Structures are given as C-alpha cells and as structure tokens.
C-alpha cells in the first residue's frame, strides 16, 4: 500500500494518540465503578459458565481478554501494583488513564510530548516529596488503633466491609502472629505464611483464626487416631513406599533360592525406615511423597497419624512453626541411616476437624514459633473467593503499615492536597512545564471525583469544598490541621479523615503515583503504530 511497501496497517499522528487514549479510557471505565466504599462488585462469566465475583482491580484486568497494546500496558500496570504493593490497584489504573488523557489533550494543543513528559516527571517527584514531608502520620503516635483503622479501610468496598470491626482484629492478630526478626534486627512480616482456607457453610462471622496451622489434608488410613494430645511432628520429603532399585541397578537371578530373600528385603527396607522413625516417639508424620497400604498399617499399629501428599510449602511452614526439620533422606554423616529426636517438631494438639462434610488437619499451638491460619466461611464458593481476595488485600495493607510506619489520610485527601500544591507550584517551573504540572494536578482529582460519583452524590460541589479546605490549609499556617480533611461518602460531606480512622500506607500512594506516571509516559511516547498482518 503506497511507496512504503509494508505488509500491514499504519496509523500516524493524532489518530494513534486518540486510539491509545481511547483504549486507556476504556480500561479505566471498566473498573471505575468498583472504587471506594460505595463501590460495587462485578461478575465475570468465563465462557463456559464459570463465575468470578470480585471487586479487586487486578483480578478484573487479569481475567479480561484485552487486545490493544496500550490497554495491555494498563493491565500489566495493575498486575505490577498488585505484586509490589497489594492495594490501590484500581486507583493506579484510573490515575494513569486520566494522566494520559490530559497529556493527549495538551499534545493536541501543539504542546510537544517531551515537554509534557518532563512536566509529568517533575510533578511526580514534587508530589512524592510533598507527601513524604507534609502528609504522613507516624504510626507510633497511634498504636494498634492505627493498624485496626488501616485494615478496616482496606476491607471497605469489599464483601467483608461491614464486618470490618471483626475482620480487622482477625487480620491484625494473624499478621502479628507470623512476625519474625532477621539479621540486622529488622522486623519482617512474611505474609503468604498465613494459610487461608475456604469452606462454605456458616455465616461470615463464623470464620476462625487458628493459633497454629491448618492443613487441607486428611489422614491416609481410617485406622489411625484422628487426635493426638502431645504431637511429635516429623516432616519427611520422601515417599514411604516399597523400595525399588534405580535404572542403573538390575536384578538377575541365577540361583533361584535368592528370590525370596530379595523380595523380602524389597519391603523390609521401608519397614526398617518406618521403625527407625517411629522408635523416637513421633506421633504425627507428614510427608510430601506417597505412602502404600503396608506403611499405613505400620502407622495404624503404632497408633500414630500419617498424612501423605502434603504440599511442599505447607510442610516448610509446618517445620518452621513447630521447630521440626525437613529430611529428604535418612542418612547421617557417618554413612548410616538414623533418625534422632532432634528433628521432631512439637505441637500442643493435632485434630482432624470436620468442616461442612469436609475434614482438615488443625495443628494448634506450635512451639518455638507462633503461626497463624484463617478459615473463611461463606454462602458459596464465590463468597469465599472474594473473601480470600479481600483478606489478602487487608494482610498486605497491614504488612505495609507495620514495615513502613507512615500512613496518610484516605478518602481523596491526599489527591486534593496534591492538586492544590501542584497547581500552586507550577507557576515557578518553566513555561510549558507549567501547563504539564497543572494538568498533572487536575488529573490527580479523578479519585475524589470517582468516589463522589459512585455514591450517587454531586461530585462538583463536594470536590470544590474539599479543594477549598485544602487550599485554606496550605495558605493559612494556623489551619494546618485541615490537611486531613477527606471525603465522608456516607453523608457526602468533608470530614477529618485522620480522626475518622481512614488511613492508607504511604507506600500505596507513592508507588501508585510513580507507576502511573511511568505508564503514562510510556504510552505518551508513541506517535506511530505499525501493525503487521498475521502470516496465516
């Protein structure tokens, strides 16, 4: 087509810029309705009837089938925000789309994209500095109440929002349970060590926080006891099965008398291993490998539990919590085959608990380390899945608050303060960077606008009042306490969100700003698209 002679389409100039902005706006409008406490969930039918009910932005954008590259950019941005922070996945997408739209509006006015990019970079840096210098609250000033409020804010907009008074306490206890310290004395909170089990049944308030660990497994044989008082847990990473020689070993019989002895040893090896393990007093034996029937019979006769096909990560968590040691093989440094009590973990109880026609192993009060696990109860599987996603969000938020001890007011207070400060500060830098920074500040206002719109309330006057409050706070040194004024969606009025218990980790806002700015810069840098036709 024409003199260029390339087998594919080509869009250049304002056309491709408008297409990219349209794609980003489409992605933003997909998830705009699921922002804030007055947000609503979504159904996602998976083409074969599978239903996913969710409010998380990352899940929605990951489950969707997207084709435009400028929209795949935003979807991957949401996924990155989920991986690196865990919260604010919808906000970052919305902010990036608004930034891109305003940047393209500037570009259409013959403002060079490089100037817009420079202005966006400067605005992002200054916004981060202003947040770190003026809009942070130290958690040590508040205490456990800060963690509870942050968690409750996290459950807002989720299916467990109304039960926040209980779920926040559960989340905080679970996070504090798994706290451990490493070298140099930094406290670390390894989330994803809190096993989360879903089982429909009783109401949401019947969810249990296990002071220990919950295994989604059952005993191998019905003959074993289903409850041990003083558990001596032994963890194995090998199958307890009939011994079979490897590929390099072959059995050739020339004297027929040796066959019986060989076949006897073929199982006597495993019998001896099991006897060695049991002789040390172990009561519970968890292995990632399989177990044949005869080994199960050995454990039955010994009066000991035995769980097979245990997940590797679950076994590692059990070993860490109970003080046990994973043994991929029974072989000491003397060349022998031994098993001493030093590798035995201990727990105050192990129970085969029954949960709605399903049974699971509860390991309670592990010694030498405290662990946690959560069992979620709901109406059906969709409720349980949404509970798990919201609970993961809350755990991530609490982890961020505990690691970095700074929080910021919620409800769009940070966005309004940043907009005011940036539109004031734009008057000093450059001549077109002025417009770029002003558009950055205006784009930051999309969050409170969306919050107000979702509540079926007048967004214009509410945002105007919030902006007036923040402007008065910035221009009057005697009214610096107004920085915390945010949005109260229940009544549609400005409210001091610091005293209202609406907090967010500072890392959420900082990472959202940085990632959204980078994505907007990346998309804005394009001015021509070549789409080669498929070879088929």
């Amino acid at each position: 087509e024409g003199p260029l002679s390339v087998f594919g389409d080509r869009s250049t100039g304002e056309t491709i810029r408008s297409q990219n902005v349209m794609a980003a706006a489409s992605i933003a409008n997909i998830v705009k309705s699921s922002l804030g406490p007055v947000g609503l969930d979504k159904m996602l039918v998976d083409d074969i009837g599978d239903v996913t009910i969710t409010n998380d932005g990352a899940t929605i954008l990951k489950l969707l089938e997207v084709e435009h590259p400028a929209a795949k950019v935003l979807c991957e941005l949401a996924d990155l925000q989920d991986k690196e922070v865990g919260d604010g996945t919808t906000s970052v997408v919305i902010i990036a789309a608004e930034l891109l739209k305003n940047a393209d509006e500037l570009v259409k006015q013959k403002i060079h994209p490089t100037s817009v990019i420079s202005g966006y970079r400067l605005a992002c840096k200054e916004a981060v500095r202003y947040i770190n210098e003026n809009l942070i609250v130290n958690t040590d000033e508040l205490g456990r109440d800060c963690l509870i409020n942050a968690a409750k804010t996290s459950m807002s907009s989720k299916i467990i929002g109304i039960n926040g008074d209980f779920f926040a306490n559960m989340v905080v206890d679970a996070v504090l349970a798994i706290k451990y310290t490493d070298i140099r004395g930094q406290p670390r909170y390894p989330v994803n060590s809190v096993n989360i089990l879903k089982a429909h049944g009783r109401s949401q308030m019947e969810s249990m926080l296990i002071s220990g660990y919950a295994l989604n497994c059952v005993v191998g044989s019905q003959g074993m006891p289903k409850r041990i008082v003083n558990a001596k847990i032994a963890c194995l990473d090998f199958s307890l099965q009939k011994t079979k020689m490897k590929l390099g070993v072959q059995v050739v019989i020339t004297d027929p008398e040796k066959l019986d002895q060989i076949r006897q040893r073929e199982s006597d090896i495993t019998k001896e291993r099991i006897q060695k393990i049991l002789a040390t007093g172990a009561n519970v034996i968890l292995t990632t490998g399989g177990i044949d029937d005869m080994c199960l019979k050995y454990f039955v006769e010994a009066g000991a539990m035995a769980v097979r096909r245990v997940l590797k990560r679950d076994l590692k968590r059990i070993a860490k919590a109970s003080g046990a040691t994973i043994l991929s093989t029974l072989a000491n440094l003397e060349g022998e085959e031994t098993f001493e009590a030093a590798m035995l973990g201990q727990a105050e109880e192990v129970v085969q608990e029954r949960i709605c026609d399903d049974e699971l192993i509860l390991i309670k009060n592990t010694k030498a380390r405290t662990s946690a696990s959560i069992i979620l109860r709901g109406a059906n599987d969709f409720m349980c899945d949404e509970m798990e996603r919201s609970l993961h969000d809350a755990l991530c938020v609490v982890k961020r608050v505990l690691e970095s001890k700074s929080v910021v007011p919620g409800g769009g207070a940070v966005e309004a303060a940043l907009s005011i400060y940036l539109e004031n500060y734009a008057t000093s830098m450059g001549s077109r960077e002025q417009l770029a920074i002003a558009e950055f500040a205006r784009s930051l206002l999309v969050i409170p606008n969306t919050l107000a719109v979702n509540a079926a309330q007048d967004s214009t006057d509410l945002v105007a009042k919030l902006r007036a409050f923040h402007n008065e706070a910035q221009v009057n040194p005697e009214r610096k306490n107004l920085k915390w004024i945010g949005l109260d969606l229940s009544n549609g009025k400005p409210r001091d969100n610091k005293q209202a218990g609406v907090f967010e980790p500072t890392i959420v806002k900082v990472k959202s700003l940085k990632f959204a700015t980078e994505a907007a810069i990346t998309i804005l840098r394009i001015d021509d698209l070549i789409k080669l036709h498929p070879e088929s």
Partner: protein, 52 residues
C-alpha cells in the same frame, strides 16, 4: 522503540531497496552503534537527489 535499526528490522519491508536500507542500518549499528537513524535518512536524501 526510537532506535532506527530496531524500527527497520521489526517491520517487514518488501522492496529490495528497503531491505538494503535495513542492512545499511544494521551495518551502522555494528560499526558505530549510534546514528542508525541518520544514515538511512542520508541515503534516502541522496537517492532523492539522484532522481533529479
């Protein structure tokens, strides 16, 4: 990408002159590493003058 050599390589040009320009950009990348966009523009301008 803004890199001239990458832009030329990624799109499958069909005319032999375009292929030769792609190889020219690749050679400039190999020998220098920068100017991969300028060299192709220079060649195009030279041939445009060659027309008249």
């Amino acid at each position: 990408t803004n890199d001239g050599a990458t832009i030329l390589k990624q799109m499958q040009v069909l005319h032999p002159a375009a292929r030769m320009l792609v190889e020219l950009s690749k050679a400039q990348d190999i020998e220098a590493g920068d100017g991969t966009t300028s060299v192709v523009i220079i060649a195009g301008s030279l041939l445009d003058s060659c027309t008249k």
